[PDB]
Design a protein around this ligand. Structure first.
Ligand SMILES: [K+]
Ligand SMILES: [K+]
Ligand SMILES: [K+]
Ligand SMILES: [Mg+2]
Lengths: 100, 276, 8
């Protein structure tokens, strides 16, 4: 059948300030079917207890989910989102870049 | 101005892993206010916005009963759809439905909706007249004939013009301090060199509600549609949304570019430039 | 309220 691969954005809820608590978001959208695996990473390792929104879909029937966790950005720590889906031959990693 | 109440249903079969999961979520505009999930330990319609919490036990009980019946109905629909497409029992398939109503500024019905998709493809939809159907193919024509024989369009019309708009108006009043408050974007332009020859200008809109926004770059007053990278509007997690638009510009030409922002929460549309 | 949907 016809499948749609996810778009992925990784970003913070509030403007990032080192040492200030915030939320790290990974928004996955545009995908079909709805089964998807999303991890948030800190220095390459999976963050535990990440929460996600309730499954819903856009006007074009593609699904979207927000995965999120509290974090405190620092100068040294790197954050990313890792996504797997039936349309991807390997997990896709998108790094958090505070300018995006 | 205008407002909508919409319910989004997703049912997904999973052969060998139990019965198809059913999820229903309800939204007023961009604000989710209820959820139901048949895989929850104790499935129940649950509040997801503060203003809905004041509804009494009858609201939660009846919506839970409706969603439990829908869980069963969607499983039967998935069995029927597999047969209408001559599909094997081995594969996973998805049924999605969206329904609800839109009202104008005076609370009057603008239009109703009921539409379904199978495996991500439009299947059948109630037409704007709330009296006839549009079927995508010969499988959906089987559903259309069944729903014509059962006068389903008349049932939907009664719901959409009655219960749906009545409850949308009630939610808009109970949640007026948020649902009828437009929060404008906070905006700024960033500049990042790419090489000696070029730089990226990125225009940011943060913290806005509802999600509808227009964010564009112009060069010498002409829209840069093809040359602009425009990310999808994305949720911040605190009710608000974010978006940005970027253009690559020749070094030294930055003042020829202007970013234009339109949003319901702004007193006036904005024109922004890079401020070095 | 939601409504009870019809079987396809
Ligand atoms: K803090
Ligand atoms: K993953
Ligand atoms: K159930
Ligand atoms: Mg099926």
């Amino acid at each position: 059948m016809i499948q749609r691969t996810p778009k992925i954005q990784v970003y913070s809820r509030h403007p990032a300030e080192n040492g200030k608590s915030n939320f790290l978001n990974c928004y996955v959208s545009g995908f079909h079917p709805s089964d998807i695996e999303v991890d948030l990473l800190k220095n390459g390792e999976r963050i535990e207890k990440v929460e996600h929104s309730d499954l819903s879909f856009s006007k074009d029937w593609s699904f979207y989910l927000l995965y999120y966790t509290e974090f405190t950005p620092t100068e040294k720590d790197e954050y990313a989102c890792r996504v797997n889906h039936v349309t991807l031959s390997q997990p896709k990693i998108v790094k958090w870049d505070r300018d995006m | 101005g205008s407002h909508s109440m919409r319910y989004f249903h997703t049912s997904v079969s999973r052969p060998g892993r139990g019965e198809p999961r059913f999820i229903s979520v309800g939204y007023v505009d961009g604000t989710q206010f209820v959820r139901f999930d048949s895989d929850a330990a104790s499935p129940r319609t649950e509040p997801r916005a503060p203003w809905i919490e004041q509804e009494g036990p009858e609201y939660w009980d009846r919506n839970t009963q409706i969603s439990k019946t829908n869980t069963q109905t969607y499983r039967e629909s998935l069995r029927n759809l597999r047969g209408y497409y001559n599909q094997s029992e081995a594969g996973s398939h998805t049924l999605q439905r969206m329904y609800g109503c839109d009202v104008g500024p005076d609370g009057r019905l603008l239009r109703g909706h009921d539409q379904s998709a199978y495996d991500g493809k439009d299947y059948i939809a109630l037409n704007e007249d709330l009296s006839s159907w549009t079927a995508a193919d010969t499988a959906a024509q089987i559903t259309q004939r069944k729903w014509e024989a059962a006068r389903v369009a008349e049932q939907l019309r009664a719901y959409l013009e009655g219960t749906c708009v009545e409850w949308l108006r009630r939610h808009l009043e109970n949640g007026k301090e948020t649902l009828q408050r437009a929060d404008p974007p906070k905006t700024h332009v960033t500049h990042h060199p790419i090489s000696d020859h070029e730089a990226t200008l990125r225009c940011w809109a943060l913290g806005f509600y509802p999600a509808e926004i227009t964010l564009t770059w112009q060069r010498d007053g002409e829209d840069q549609t093809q040359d602009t990278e425009l990310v999808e509007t994305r949720p911040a997690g605190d009710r608000t949304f974010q978006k940005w638009a970027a253009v690559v510009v020749p070094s030294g030409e930055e003042q020829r570019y202007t970013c234009h922002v339109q949003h319901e929460g702004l007193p006036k549309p904005l024109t922004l430039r890079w401020e070095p | 309220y939601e409504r009870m949907c019809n079987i396809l």
